[model samples]
Target: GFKQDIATLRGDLRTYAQDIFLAFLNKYPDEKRNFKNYVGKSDQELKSMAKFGDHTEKVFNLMMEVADRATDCVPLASDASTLVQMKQHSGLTTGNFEKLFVALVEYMRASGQSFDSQSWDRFGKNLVSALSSAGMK
Candidate 1:
Protein backbone atom coordinates (compact mmCIF):
# COMPACT_ATOMS: atom_id res chain seq x y z
CA GLY A 1 0.00 0.00 0.00
CA PHE A 2 2.80 2.38 0.90
CA LYS A 3 4.68 1.50 -2.25
CA GLN A 4 1.57 1.99 -4.32
CA ASP A 5 1.01 5.40 -2.77
CA ILE A 6 4.60 6.32 -3.48
CA ALA A 7 4.14 5.23 -7.07
CA THR A 8 1.13 7.51 -7.38
CA LEU A 9 3.08 10.36 -5.83
CA ARG A 10 5.93 9.78 -8.29
CA GLY A 11 3.54 10.43 -11.16
CA ASP A 12 2.97 13.98 -9.95
CA LEU A 13 6.23 14.64 -8.16
CA ARG A 14 6.84 18.18 -9.35
CA THR A 15 3.50 19.61 -8.31
CA TYR A 16 3.57 17.74 -5.05
CA ALA A 17 7.10 18.97 -4.40
CA GLN A 18 6.14 22.59 -4.87
CA ASP A 19 3.13 22.20 -2.63
CA ILE A 20 5.06 20.43 0.12
CA PHE A 21 7.85 22.99 0.03
CA LEU A 22 5.38 25.81 0.31
CA ALA A 23 3.57 24.00 3.11
CA PHE A 24 6.83 23.59 5.03
CA LEU A 25 7.68 27.24 4.62
CA ASN A 26 4.24 28.28 5.70
CA LYS A 27 4.17 25.97 8.71
CA TYR A 28 7.66 26.78 9.89
CA PRO A 29 8.60 30.37 9.27
CA ASP A 30 11.80 29.91 11.26
CA GLU A 31 12.96 27.30 8.79
CA LYS A 32 11.99 29.65 5.98
CA ARG A 33 14.51 32.14 7.29
CA ASN A 34 17.26 29.62 6.50
CA PHE A 35 16.73 30.24 2.81
CA LYS A 36 18.50 33.50 2.03
CA ASN A 37 17.02 33.78 -1.45
CA TYR A 38 13.47 33.30 -0.24
CA VAL A 39 13.70 35.74 2.67
CA GLY A 40 11.17 38.59 2.63
CA LYS A 41 9.70 37.31 -0.64
CA SER A 42 6.02 37.11 -1.29
CA ASP A 43 4.46 33.75 -2.16
CA GLN A 44 4.24 34.78 -5.81
CA GLU A 45 7.86 35.84 -5.87
CA LEU A 46 8.98 32.64 -4.21
CA LYS A 47 7.02 30.56 -6.64
CA SER A 48 8.43 32.49 -9.57
CA MET A 49 12.04 32.00 -8.58
CA ALA A 50 13.90 29.39 -10.58
CA LYS A 51 16.20 28.77 -7.64
CA PHE A 52 13.25 27.95 -5.40
CA GLY A 53 11.81 25.57 -7.94
CA ASP A 54 15.15 23.91 -8.51
CA HIS A 55 15.79 23.40 -4.81
CA THR A 56 12.30 22.04 -4.30
CA GLU A 57 12.79 19.59 -7.13
CA LYS A 58 16.15 18.52 -5.77
CA VAL A 59 14.76 17.90 -2.28
CA PHE A 60 11.75 16.06 -3.58
CA ASN A 61 13.83 13.88 -5.88
CA LEU A 62 15.92 12.82 -2.94
CA MET A 63 12.76 12.13 -0.98
CA MET A 64 11.42 9.89 -3.71
CA GLU A 65 14.71 8.09 -3.91
CA VAL A 66 14.54 7.42 -0.17
CA ALA A 67 10.91 6.41 -0.42
CA ASP A 68 11.89 3.83 -2.95
CA ARG A 69 13.81 2.24 -0.13
CA ALA A 70 10.86 2.25 2.23
CA THR A 71 11.09 -1.47 2.79
CA ASP A 72 14.37 -0.84 4.58
CA CYS A 73 13.43 2.65 5.70
CA VAL A 74 17.01 3.74 6.06
CA PRO A 75 18.93 6.16 3.90
CA LEU A 76 21.34 4.78 1.38
CA ALA A 77 25.03 5.50 1.83
CA SER A 78 24.96 8.38 -0.61
CA ASP A 79 21.77 9.78 0.86
CA ALA A 80 23.17 9.57 4.35
CA SER A 81 26.34 11.24 3.15
CA THR A 82 24.29 13.98 1.53
CA LEU A 83 22.31 14.48 4.72
CA VAL A 84 25.50 14.67 6.73
CA GLN A 85 26.87 17.32 4.46
CA MET A 86 23.60 19.24 4.40
CA LYS A 87 23.44 19.19 8.19
CA GLN A 88 26.97 20.54 8.38
CA HIS A 89 26.45 23.17 5.72
CA SER A 90 22.92 24.24 6.44
CA GLY A 91 22.72 23.87 10.21
CA LEU A 92 19.66 21.70 9.84
CA THR A 93 18.59 20.15 13.10
CA THR A 94 17.08 16.73 13.62
CA GLY A 95 13.95 18.56 14.71
CA ASN A 96 13.84 20.40 11.40
CA PHE A 97 14.09 17.14 9.53
CA GLU A 98 11.30 15.73 11.65
CA LYS A 99 9.04 18.72 11.06
CA LEU A 100 9.71 18.77 7.34
CA PHE A 101 8.49 15.19 6.94
CA VAL A 102 5.57 15.97 9.19
CA ALA A 103 4.76 18.74 6.73
CA LEU A 104 4.97 16.23 3.92
CA VAL A 105 2.49 13.89 5.60
CA GLU A 106 0.17 16.76 6.37
CA TYR A 107 0.36 17.93 2.77
CA MET A 108 -0.45 14.46 1.51
CA ARG A 109 -3.41 14.20 3.82
CA ALA A 110 -4.77 17.64 3.02
CA SER A 111 -4.21 17.26 -0.73
CA GLY A 112 -5.93 13.87 -0.82
CA GLN A 113 -2.87 11.88 -1.75
CA SER A 114 -3.28 8.15 -1.27
CA PHE A 115 -1.02 6.72 1.42
CA ASP A 116 -0.92 4.24 4.27
CA SER A 117 -0.36 6.28 7.40
CA GLN A 118 1.01 3.36 9.39
CA SER A 119 3.62 2.59 6.76
CA TRP A 120 4.47 6.22 6.35
CA ASP A 121 4.89 6.64 10.09
CA ARG A 122 7.14 3.63 10.22
CA PHE A 123 9.29 4.94 7.41
CA GLY A 124 9.43 8.43 8.88
CA LYS A 125 10.64 7.14 12.22
CA ASN A 126 13.30 5.01 10.61
CA LEU A 127 14.43 7.89 8.47
CA VAL A 128 14.83 10.10 11.51
CA SER A 129 16.77 7.36 13.24
CA ALA A 130 19.06 7.11 10.24
CA LEU A 131 19.52 10.85 10.20
CA SER A 132 20.27 10.88 13.92
CA SER A 133 22.92 8.23 13.45
CA ALA A 134 24.36 10.34 10.68
CA GLY A 135 24.81 13.14 13.23
CA MET A 136 21.97 15.37 12.10
CA LYS A 137 21.20 16.38 15.71
Candidate 2:
Protein backbone atom coordinates (compact mmCIF):
# COMPACT_ATOMS: atom_id res chain seq x y z
CA GLY A 1 0.00 0.00 0.00
CA PHE A 2 2.76 2.41 0.94
CA LYS A 3 4.73 1.47 -2.13
CA GLN A 4 1.66 2.01 -4.26
CA ASP A 5 1.12 5.40 -2.65
CA ILE A 6 4.26 6.86 -4.22
CA ALA A 7 4.95 4.53 -7.09
CA THR A 8 2.75 6.49 -9.45
CA LEU A 9 4.53 9.76 -8.74
CA ARG A 10 7.98 8.68 -9.70
CA GLY A 11 8.08 11.37 -12.34
CA ASP A 12 7.20 14.05 -9.83
CA LEU A 13 9.84 12.65 -7.52
CA ARG A 14 12.42 13.25 -10.23
CA THR A 15 11.29 16.83 -10.61
CA TYR A 16 11.27 17.35 -6.88
CA ALA A 17 14.78 16.01 -6.68
CA GLN A 18 15.85 18.73 -9.08
CA ASP A 19 13.78 21.40 -7.36
CA ILE A 20 15.29 20.79 -3.95
CA PHE A 21 18.82 20.89 -5.30
CA LEU A 22 18.07 24.21 -6.98
CA ALA A 23 16.42 25.46 -3.80
CA PHE A 24 19.53 24.54 -1.87
CA LEU A 25 21.75 26.17 -4.44
CA ASN A 26 20.16 29.50 -3.62
CA LYS A 27 19.39 28.85 0.05
CA TYR A 28 22.81 27.42 0.80
CA PRO A 29 25.55 28.94 -1.33
CA ASP A 30 28.04 26.31 -0.30
CA GLU A 31 25.76 23.75 -1.84
CA LYS A 32 25.95 25.45 -5.22
CA ARG A 33 29.70 25.66 -5.27
CA ASN A 34 29.92 22.13 -4.01
CA PHE A 35 28.21 21.04 -7.20
CA LYS A 36 30.04 23.66 -9.20
CA ASN A 37 29.49 21.97 -12.54
CA TYR A 38 25.84 22.87 -12.29
CA VAL A 39 26.52 26.57 -11.88
CA GLY A 40 24.79 28.87 -14.38
CA LYS A 41 22.34 26.21 -15.48
CA SER A 42 18.64 26.92 -15.81
CA ASP A 43 16.25 25.14 -13.45
CA GLN A 44 14.91 23.14 -16.35
CA GLU A 45 18.40 22.26 -17.42
CA LEU A 46 19.23 20.99 -13.98
CA LYS A 47 16.05 19.00 -13.87
CA SER A 48 16.84 17.31 -17.14
CA MET A 49 20.31 16.36 -16.17
CA ALA A 50 21.30 12.74 -15.75
CA LYS A 51 22.75 13.20 -12.28
CA PHE A 52 19.44 14.40 -10.88
CA GLY A 53 17.71 11.51 -12.57
CA ASP A 54 20.04 9.03 -10.94
CA HIS A 55 19.79 10.73 -7.59
CA THR A 56 16.03 10.80 -7.80
CA GLU A 57 15.81 7.11 -8.58
CA LYS A 58 18.17 6.24 -5.76
CA VAL A 59 16.35 8.36 -3.20
CA PHE A 60 12.95 7.23 -4.38
CA ASN A 61 13.97 3.64 -4.01
CA LEU A 62 14.99 4.24 -0.43
CA MET A 63 11.76 6.04 0.32
CA MET A 64 9.73 3.17 -1.08
CA GLU A 65 11.63 0.67 0.99
CA VAL A 66 11.31 2.63 4.21
CA ALA A 67 7.64 3.37 3.69
CA ASP A 68 6.84 -0.23 2.88
CA ARG A 69 8.51 -1.35 6.08
CA ALA A 70 7.10 1.19 8.49
CA THR A 71 7.77 -0.45 11.78
CA ASP A 72 8.92 0.83 15.17
CA CYS A 73 12.09 -1.11 14.53
CA VAL A 74 12.84 1.07 11.51
CA PRO A 75 15.73 3.57 11.79
CA LEU A 76 17.07 0.86 14.08
CA ALA A 77 18.01 -1.56 11.31
CA SER A 78 19.07 -1.01 7.70
CA ASP A 79 16.95 2.11 7.54
CA ALA A 80 18.85 3.70 10.38
CA SER A 81 22.15 2.55 8.96
CA THR A 82 21.33 4.27 5.70
CA LEU A 83 20.62 7.57 7.46
CA VAL A 84 23.71 7.30 9.58
CA GLN A 85 25.80 6.59 6.51
CA MET A 86 24.44 9.65 4.77
CA LYS A 87 25.16 11.83 7.81
CA GLN A 88 28.63 10.44 8.11
CA HIS A 89 29.67 10.80 4.49
CA SER A 90 27.26 12.99 2.54
CA GLY A 91 27.62 16.40 4.16
CA LEU A 92 24.06 15.91 5.34
CA THR A 93 23.40 18.46 8.07
CA THR A 94 20.22 18.96 10.04
CA GLY A 95 19.16 21.96 8.01
CA ASN A 96 19.54 20.07 4.75
CA PHE A 97 17.70 17.14 6.24
CA GLU A 98 14.76 19.31 7.23
CA LYS A 99 14.68 21.04 3.89
CA LEU A 100 14.74 17.80 1.94
CA PHE A 101 12.10 16.29 4.18
CA VAL A 102 9.76 19.20 3.61
CA ALA A 103 10.47 19.09 -0.10
CA LEU A 104 9.42 15.45 -0.24
CA VAL A 105 6.22 16.15 1.69
CA GLU A 106 5.42 19.11 -0.52
CA TYR A 107 6.03 17.01 -3.61
CA MET A 108 3.52 14.47 -2.34
CA ARG A 109 0.98 17.22 -1.71
CA ALA A 110 1.55 18.77 -5.09
CA SER A 111 0.97 15.43 -6.76
CA GLY A 112 -2.42 15.02 -5.07
CA GLN A 113 -1.15 11.88 -3.41
CA SER A 114 -3.70 11.92 -0.57
CA PHE A 115 -0.81 11.55 1.80
CA ASP A 116 -2.40 12.11 5.17
CA SER A 117 -1.03 14.11 8.08
CA GLN A 118 -1.05 11.16 10.46
CA SER A 119 1.15 9.15 8.12
CA TRP A 120 3.40 12.13 7.74
CA ASP A 121 3.59 12.49 11.49
CA ARG A 122 4.64 8.92 12.00
CA PHE A 123 7.18 8.90 9.18
CA GLY A 124 8.59 12.35 9.87
CA LYS A 125 9.01 11.73 13.56
CA ASN A 126 10.65 8.41 12.98
CA LEU A 127 13.00 9.98 10.43
CA VAL A 128 14.07 12.65 12.87
CA SER A 129 14.39 10.21 15.72
CA ALA A 130 16.53 7.91 13.61
CA LEU A 131 18.83 10.68 12.46
CA SER A 132 18.99 12.09 15.98
CA SER A 133 20.46 8.81 17.08
CA ALA A 134 23.40 9.76 14.89
CA GLY A 135 23.79 13.19 16.55
CA MET A 136 22.11 14.93 13.66
CA LYS A 137 20.47 17.47 16.00
Can you give the TM-score per candidate against the true fold?
0.86, 0.67
lDDT score of residue 105 within candidate 2:
58
Identify the leading candidate in terms of TM-score: 1
Report every candidate's CA lDDT. 0.75, 0.60
- Per-residue lDDT tens digits for candidate 2, residues 73-135, read 244556755766773336655555555555555555655446553455456667777776766
Per-prediction tally of clashes? 0, 0
Model 1: lDDT to the true structure: 0.75
Task: Write the residue-wise lDDT of candidate 1 on 1-137 in tens digits.
Answer: 77787777678877778888889888998987678888998777887988887888878888888888645555565666577676434677677778887887777677655577666666777778777777777
List candidate 1 segments past 4 Å from native.
Answer: 87-90
